[PDB]
Design a protein around this ligand. Structure first.
Ligand SMILES: C[C@@H]1Cc2c([nH]c3ccccc23)[C@@H](c2c(F)cc(/C=C/C(=O)O)cc2F)N1CC(C)(C)F
Ligand SMILES: C[C@@H]1Cc2c([nH]c3ccccc23)[C@@H](c2c(F)cc(/C=C/C(=O)O)cc2F)N1CC(C)(C)F
Lengths: 228, 228
């Protein structure tokens, strides 16, 4: 992972990309939204485990650390995936190709429209920045590696050091993508910052979402079982 | 604000710095922690309003937008201030020069040790990066401008554009501080990213804190009254 060039990193992440899934409702039957959003989230998680295993550097970590990172990040990762898919559908969230929802559809569950609104605003922000596919995959891997790295022994010190070196490789890669796109050195650092600052909002959204779910979620054991 | 050089930006933010406050307990009397932490937070907020008014670009915004940004950011701002103060006190949080608390002292309030632990880990991270005073003030201003900018009309479009241009000026400034410190172009972009990625964790901490407080906070009106 640490010997990868920028191009190889990008290629590795594009190749790791999980599939776009479909919602499981009978489309011949009349139009629970929570049920739909929960089942879809559950199925995407399985694919997320597989994707994570293909992010360079991730399988170098201990099982326990892999679980911790996924436990911290999974909802952020679903949400960034959603916002990216939704980017060319103004005012709509593309949960699946057959489940494209507006804010009014979110109003049927108490507390949900607020979450839909934040996701829609993020998709809007991505649209305004003209986020590229290659930048998206970098950001999604940054979330996986970064979200739990501050909440973890000699092994632990080595693990954190490795995570930060891999994150540095992804930073390098982002800059290289922006240099290749023809941005000036100024523009490259400005855009890097703009992209990383959106991750704080994605964190925020995840916290607001987890709050909703706790008020009613993959356990450590399920993540461990799937990762192990 | 947008015509400022890097040096002028840094000078402006250092000059805006609020004071370090003292806790209000009688030190001759025997050692409520929540009361102490609440009163201190309340007094710091007043100074935060004043500090915010001196961040270049902030008073250019509408009152409503200034309030929204502070409403979103205030706990993140207190927390980054805390973590910065605590940096050269391993295992302790320097809430005030007369209130230096360890994790065990946090255990007296249910849910508080978890929050103390996350703050301590952030201070540890800052220590490992050797965070500079000049970088800290940049980051604290980034929090103010960024935390609410995704959760807000023609005026609103102009406001967001301005906020992002000011954020770009702070990104420029950070890079300039790192170039002046002698870091290579690679090191500059890596360190920029490392610093901005810590902001996601600060967001996380704030959400976890606000959760605690809601389960029991400055209203819009109080912030508005103080800002207006
Ligand atoms: C709207 C958000 C984000 C989201 C959801 N479902 C998705 C499917 C694909 C991509 C993104 C999502 C949905 C969502 C949901 F409605 C239920 C669960 C429950 C999962 C479980 O019980 O394991 C998870 C979700 F992500 N979520 C709501 C919330 C409150 C978490 F922000
Ligand atoms: C430990 C955290 C962060 C914090 C607190 N007090 C500070 C004073 C100076 C600097 C930082 C802090 C404390 C804190 C507190 F214990 C009560 C309030 C309540 C304020 C209000 O009611 O207006 C605010 C706080 F920041 N906080 C706990 C929590 C749960 C919010 F994360």
């Amino acid at each position: 992972a640490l010997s990868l060039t920028a191009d190889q990193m990008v290629s590795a992440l594009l190749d790791a990309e999980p599939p776009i899934l479909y919602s499981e409702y009978d489309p011949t039957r009349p139009f629970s939204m929570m049920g739909l959003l929960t089942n879809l989230a559950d199925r995407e998680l399985v694919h997320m485990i597989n994707w994570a295993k293909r992010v360079p550097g991730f399988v170098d970590l201990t099982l326990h650390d892999q679980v911790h990172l996924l436990e911290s990040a999974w909802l952020e990762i679903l949400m960034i995936g959603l916002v990216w898919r939704s980017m060319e559908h103004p005012g709509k969230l593309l949960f699946a190709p057959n489940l494209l929802l507006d804010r009014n559809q979110g109003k049927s569950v108490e507390g949900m429209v607020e979450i839909f609104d934040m996701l829609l605003a993020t998709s809007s922000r991505f649209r305004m920045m003209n986020l590229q596919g290659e930048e998206f995959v970098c950001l999604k891997s940054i979330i996986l590696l970064n979200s739990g790295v501050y909440t973890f022994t000699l092994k632990s010190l080595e693990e954190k050091d490795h995570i930060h070196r891999v994150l540095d490789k992804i930073t390098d890669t982002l800059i290289h993508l922006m240099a290749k796109a023809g941005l000036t050195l100024q523009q490259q650092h400005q855009r890097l910052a703009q992209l990383l600052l959106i991750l704080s909002h994605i964190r925020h959204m995840s916290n607001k979402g987890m709050e909703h779910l706790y008020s009613m979620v993959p356990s450590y054991d399920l993540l461990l079982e799937m990762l192990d």
